[PDB]
Design a protein around this ligand. Structure first.
Ligand SMILES: C[C@@H]1COCCN1c1cc(N2CCOC[C@@H]2C)nc2[nH]c(-c3cc[nH]n3)nc12
Lengths: 263, 986
């Protein structure tokens, strides 16, 4: 027929086609009006790309090349739905096999009266904003958590390097100590051996304290590392639901404008 | 790693006045010492070695002058403090302890690498740990650009070194627009020159009227071995450009303001010039094959396994790995998925077979893969959500095809991204190894598979008009870079690819017709671009976007810029030129070498080159790339590194100061916060840092001493800071004596920084076309993660502040601009409404109101807080309408019509409409430039600017798919529907 076939989508934009053809198998096709009348543009999927094949028009005949043979766009689409495009241009060796039908546009409509559609559109629009606020909120905790984890990790890097310094201090003190505690052992200077020992205890204590500060920070890191993974999960669960929720909202809106008076 | 916070210690934003510091003496002793937070190391080292005598083994301690301090900084780096004049609070210590050590190694080489690490925001020694060969090769091989720059910099006497420090801020053409030349009388421009007296530095006014064509040396000779300078800042007329070409004079012409200039002896300037001495680093000191075309087989990659993914089993059903071969943004073949495995068992070992010939893989071929979650619980439609992504270059930087097993750490999905793959994303592995890891395996061809040479390319290349046809080719070149390109037109260009050389501008469209999946067509195209006449710079840039990845293509683009890109336009488009560096596959390319060469030969360029790179060092996807580029720049930028660190340390204290106000003191009243803020800004460490340094908004502006009275914490949410300085220039009474800036810590100013850049570019287009739509594009700069600076326009108040009646806005302008100056204020308010009304509609700026719009006593309109742009409201509410954000209200129309009722029926509103129509068409004429500018920003990270389908918004507000007669009728219709009638056609 005329403007009744399913692959004719009238005045859809290239973006509407790219989404209708995104991640589609080679051969998926559809036709729309000229972006720049009544000129037409067949859109075909080939090698993960969206190829635009203009449908020229001269004195009641349609075709891709100069010898416009076909007398109707329906006759052109149906022919190449069974014949390969390579006969026209060898570079495109595929056929119109997967038609994008208006079935998807009329899908999800559900209701038939403007009020029901509008009342239902208002329900979906409410749930969408409520899941967007929920998502945007969850995203900030996601970003905040990710940053504070990077900080804690760098801090633990600092704790290690610091502990290495204080441990170097110990082995340093052990080397000089013997050469002098043995000299006091014979020089009867017992109280000077106690002063050296006391400073060593002061140093071992700090090391034992600094290690516990790293232990508590490492414990906090485990707590935050998991809290990040739970946030990531909740986000990878809200993203797929939020998407189609937005699409369903847009469709109800598309249904409302078409059924309503247009300019 | 980079610093966690900006505090004086980990977990503390401010040291108390006194604090305890553990000192590790070289004899194993540990001495606890109480120090003033502001104490210097030379002092602490003194008191420490006085106290040490009270401890054992004090005999074997050498002289205190024989030691220095070392400690662990908040970057986990063990730093040696060779500058014992630094304060304890300025050390960025992790914990309060100091070790005493005898200095070793190259002391000079250590001091530089510490200064370089400070500006970078990361220890340079971390680059030494990088095992990646490409990294080290970049660090060594990039030095030749450095040397060649520092050589040209001192090729002559101080004059050459002067052109580097104070380049001429000149336009790209000395031709004066017809509306600018009218301001001159008989082609002459009156100028006043002041000369500081040799004794007592008195001012000698010497008004004179001279031709705009006359070179600075010619006006100098008037005076009835010397240099000129602008009073108030540090920009010098060091070249023989026409005085009109210099921006300061050209602006003064249109603004009617009389140019005030200062004459200098040129010896005080040459003497202050330092010795920009570059020294080779340490990594420069210490340091069978089969062609790709010979490999006969199809491409295949074994997806072995992955570690984990974060998603509860109760919501997501299965997971799979989606892969795909890409050349830029377009796939070289249909994407190939693996089998759907349960979330808890990421294992495939499934050799993915791609429908592509191995010999036909283009040079820039890449693999884009991601781990997706499938959720088929909602009917026939099963939702696919991406979990993590990653990209790889099939050829490494050495033309060597990949082979063997490989491990890859994947990145999180960028907010707002909905596609299953992210081919615009950066290549390589994620440095965060606490992320999912994907095991792959490329087959191996019993030899190192390499890409054929340029010689073999041309061999395979040589192996292979109607006037109306000529017109179709011409029109295809004129179309914008984002217009639809049908297959018929692709073959049309490909079949006439040789004739296209006469119309060089068509090359972008021509490259889109190439079957990059065909070694045959690719080889032939290499030969056409090799001998393709250079194109204009604004059009070459398009070749650097995510659509043109091939090296030969990008190389040609680079050589166009090297040949025809002025230092003015390079500073004008620097934002995008820095952004496009993310798209390059390898660290060492011609683009980066050209930019670095320009950064090292122009300080006005290198300054923003540095801050643009620094502002994204927090971003782990480009931190290594920009880190290595910053290391090379600082290693050779000469003495300006000292001034950059002065800027970095000043910002670090403002970040710390504002961090305390919004964290530790968030619940205290503003009367208490100001008390705390004034008390902190009076300390020695804070005044030494935030006084006497160059302004990051404009290194020509000298930020001197603070005016604490004018400083104030803004009574807002983000708690911004308004700061005031004194202009130390002797002639500070001319340009300005107070330089005010708003320090914002919390709001991402990148989108606002880009919007102000496009507004400048828009105003430049108008001035060249005789349209003084006097716009005030104040300065905005992002210097970190949600940290930035904004120039404070003096004497401006919001339209809501003015109203605290319809005529209220007009009666206010009647005051502060009463009398003979009235017609000037109205002319500015109108000319600014036109530029803003057109710029906001074209871009889709967030709605304006009495708070986003401001008016200066000048009558100048100043919009603020643009925020969103493009189709940002389409995702929230699915409306397919182009919005009119800036709707002139009755209050605004009364001002334009000089207070006349029936404002739509006045000659002033007629001229107002003319400016809008002329400005809208003017921009529409340059739509190729603006579509490329946004195209070069797709990998930036702004949520409202991700896919080319976001840029299509400006393709609609400019009605590009309509005729210029239909576009002006569309603009009128849009403006007339938003203003409720009034816009007429004449
Ligand atoms: C620096 C700019 C322009 O010069 C005048 C001052 N200016 C601003 C003033 C202002 N308010 C004044 C009133 O109290 C609240 C708030 C502090 N808010 C802003 N927000 C932005 C902005 C820019 C990008 N994004 N946002 N600029 C300004």
């Amino acid at each position: 027929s005329l403007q009744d076939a399913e692959w004719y989508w009238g005045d859809i934009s290239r973006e509407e086609v790219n989404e209708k053809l995104r991640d589609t198998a080679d051969g998926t096709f559809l036709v729309r009006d000229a972006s720049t009348h009544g000129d037409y543009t067949l859109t075909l999927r080939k090698g993960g790309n969206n190829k635009l094949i203009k449908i020229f028009h001269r004195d009641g005949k349609y075709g891709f090349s100069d010898p416009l043979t076909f007398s109707s766009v329906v006759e052109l689409i149906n022919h190449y739905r069974n014949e390969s495009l390579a006969q026209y241009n060898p570079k495109l060796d595929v056929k119109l096999l997967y038609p994008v039908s208006k079935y998807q546009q009329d899908q999800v409509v559900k209701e038939d009266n403007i009020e029901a559609v509008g009342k239902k559109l208002h329900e979906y629009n409410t749930q969408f904003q409520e899941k967007s606020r929920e998502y945007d909120r969850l995203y900030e905790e996601y970003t905040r958590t990710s940053q504070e984890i990077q900080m804690k990790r760098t801090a633990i890097e600092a704790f290690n390097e610091t502990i290495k310094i204080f441990e170097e201090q110990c082995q340093t003190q052990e080397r000089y100590s013997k050469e002098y505690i043995e000299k006091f052992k014979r020089e009867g200077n017992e109280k000077e051996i106690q002063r050296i020992m006391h400073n060593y205890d002061k140093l071992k204590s700090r090391i034992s304290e600094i290690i516990d500060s790293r232990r508590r920070l490492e414990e906090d890191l485990k707590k935050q590392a998991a809290e990040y993974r739970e946030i990531d999960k909740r986000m990878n669960s809200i993203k797929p639901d939020l998407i189609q929720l937005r699409k369903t909202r847009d469709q109800y809106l598309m249904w409302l404008t078409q059924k309503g008076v247009r300019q | 790693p980079p610093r966690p916070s900006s505090g004086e210690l980990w977990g503390i934003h401010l040291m108390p006045p006194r604090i305890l510091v553990e000192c590790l003496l070289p004899n194993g002793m540990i001495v606890t010492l109480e120090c003033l937070r502001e104490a210097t190391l030379i002092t602490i080292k003194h008191e420490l070695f006085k106290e040490a005598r009270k401890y054992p083994l004090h005999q074997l301690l050498q002289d205190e002058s024989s030691y220095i301090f070392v400690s662990v900084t908040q970057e986990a780096e063990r730093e040696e403090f060779f500058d014992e004049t630094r304060r304890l609070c300025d050390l960025r210590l992790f914990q309060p302890f100091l070790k005493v050590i005898e200095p070793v190694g190259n002391r000079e080489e250590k001091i530089l690498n510490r200064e370089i690490g400070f500006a970078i925001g990361m220890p340079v020694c971390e680059f030494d740990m990088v095992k990646d060969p490409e990294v080290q090769d970049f660090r060594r091989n990039i030095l030749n650009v450095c040397k060649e720059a520092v050589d040209l910099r001192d090729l002559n006497s101080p004059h050459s070194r002067a052109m580097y420090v104070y380049p001429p801020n000149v336009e790209s053409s000395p031709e004066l627009p017809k509306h600018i030349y009218n301001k001159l009388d008989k082609g002459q421009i009156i100028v006043v020159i002041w000369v500081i007296v040799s004794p007592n530095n008195d001012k000698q006014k010497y008004t004179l009227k001279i031709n705009h064509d006359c070179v600075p040396e010619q006006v100098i000779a008037e005076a009835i071995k010397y240099i000129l300078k602008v009073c108030g800042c540090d920009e010098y007329f060091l070249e023989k450009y026409p005085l009109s070409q210099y921006k300061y004079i050209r602006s003064c012409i249109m603004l009617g303001r009389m140019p005030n200039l200062m004459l200098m002896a040129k010896e005080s300037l040459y003497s202050q010039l330092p010795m920009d001495c570059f020294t080779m680093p340490s990594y420069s000191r210490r340091i069978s094959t089969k062609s790709l075309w010979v490999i006969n087989s199809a491409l295949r990659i074994k997806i072995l396994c992955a570690t984990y993914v974060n998603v509860n089993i109760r919501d997501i059903d299965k997971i799979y790995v989606r892969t795909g071969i890409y050349h830029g943004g377009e796939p070289l073949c249909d994407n190939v998925n693996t089998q759907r495995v349960p979330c808890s068992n990421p294992r495939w070992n499934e050799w993915l077979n791609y429908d592509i010939y191995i010999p036909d893989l283009p040079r820039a071929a890449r693999l884009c893969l991601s781990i997706c979650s499938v959720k088929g619980r909602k009917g026939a439609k099963e939702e696919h959500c991406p979990l993590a992504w990653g990209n790889i270059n099939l050829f490494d930087y050495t033309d060597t095809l990949v082979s063997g097993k490989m491990a890859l750490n994947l990145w999180p999905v960028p907010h707002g991204l909905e596609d299953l793959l992210n081919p615009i994303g950066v290549t390589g592995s994620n440095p965060n190894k606490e992320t999912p890891c994907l095991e792959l395996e490329f087959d191996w061809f019993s030899s190192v598979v390499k890409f054929p040479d340029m010689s073999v390319i041309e061999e395979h290349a040589n192996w292979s008009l109607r006037e109306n046809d000529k017109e179709q080719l011409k029109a295809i070149s004129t179309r914008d870079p984002l217009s639809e390109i049908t297959e018929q037109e692709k073959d049309f260009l490909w079949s006439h690819r040789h004739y296209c050389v006469t119309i060089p501008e068509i090359l972008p469209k021509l490259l889109l017709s190439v079957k990059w999946n065909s070694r045959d067509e690719v080889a032939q195209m290499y030969c056409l671009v090799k001998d393709w006449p250079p194109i204009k710079p604004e059009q070459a840039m398009e070749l650097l976007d995510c659509n043109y990845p091939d090296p030969m293509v990008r190389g040609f683009a680079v050589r166009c810029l090297e040949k025809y890109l002025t230092d003015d336009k390079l500073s004008q488009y620097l934002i995008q030129l820095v952004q496009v560096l993310k798209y390059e596959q390898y660290l060492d390319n011609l683009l980066v070498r050209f930019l670095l060469k320009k950064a090292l030969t122009n300080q006005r360029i290198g300054h923003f080159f540095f801050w643009h790179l620094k502002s994204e060092m927090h971003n782990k996807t480009v931190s290594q790339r920009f880190g290595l580029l910053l290391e090379s720049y600082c290693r050779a930028c000469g003495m300006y590194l000292k001034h950059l660190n002065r800027q970095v340390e000043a910002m670090e204290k403002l970040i710390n100061l504002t961090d305390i106000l919004k964290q530790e003191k968030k619940d205290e009243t503003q009367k208490v916060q100001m008390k705390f803020l004034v008390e902190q800004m009076r300390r020695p460490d804070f005044m030494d840092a935030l006084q006497g340094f160059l302004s990051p908004l404009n290194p020509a502006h000298q930020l001197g001493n603070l005016r604490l009275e004018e400083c104030r914490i803004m009574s807002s949410a983000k708690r911004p800071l308004k700061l005031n300085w004194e202009n130390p220039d002797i002639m500070s009474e001319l340009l300005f004596q107070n330089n005010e800036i708003m320090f914002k810590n919390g709001d991402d100013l990148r989108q606002d920084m880009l919007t102000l850049q496009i507004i400048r570019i828009m105003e430049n287009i108008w001035q060249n076309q005789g349209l003084d739509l006097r716009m005030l594009p104040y300065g905005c700069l992002s210097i970190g993660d949600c940290v930035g600076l904004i120039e404070w326009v003096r004497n401006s108040h919001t339209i809501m502040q003015i109203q605290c009646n319809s005529h209220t806005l007009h009666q206010w302008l009647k005051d502060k601009n009463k009398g003979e100056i009235y017609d000037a204020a109205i002319d500015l308010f109108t000319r600014s409404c036109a530029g803003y009304c057109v710029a906001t509609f074209i871009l889709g700026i967030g709605d304006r109101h009495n708070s986003n719009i401001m008016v200066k006593d000048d009558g100048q309109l100043v919009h603020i807080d643009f925020g969103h742009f493009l189709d940002h409201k389409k995702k929230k509410f699915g409306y397919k309408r182009e919005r009119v954000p800036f709707v002139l209200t009755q209050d605004f129309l009364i001002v334009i019509s000089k207070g006349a009722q029936e404002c739509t029926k006045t000659r002033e509103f007629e001229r107002f409409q003319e400016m809008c129509y002329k400005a809208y068409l003017a921009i529409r004429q340059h739509a190729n430039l603006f579509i490329n500018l946004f195209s070069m920003m797709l990998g930036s990270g702004m949520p409202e600017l991700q896919s080319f389908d976001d840029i299509a918004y400006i393709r609609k507000t400019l009605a590009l798919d309509k005729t210029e007669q239909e576009a002006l009728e569309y603009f009128m219709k849009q403006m007339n529907d938003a203003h409720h009638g009034g816009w007429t056609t004449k």
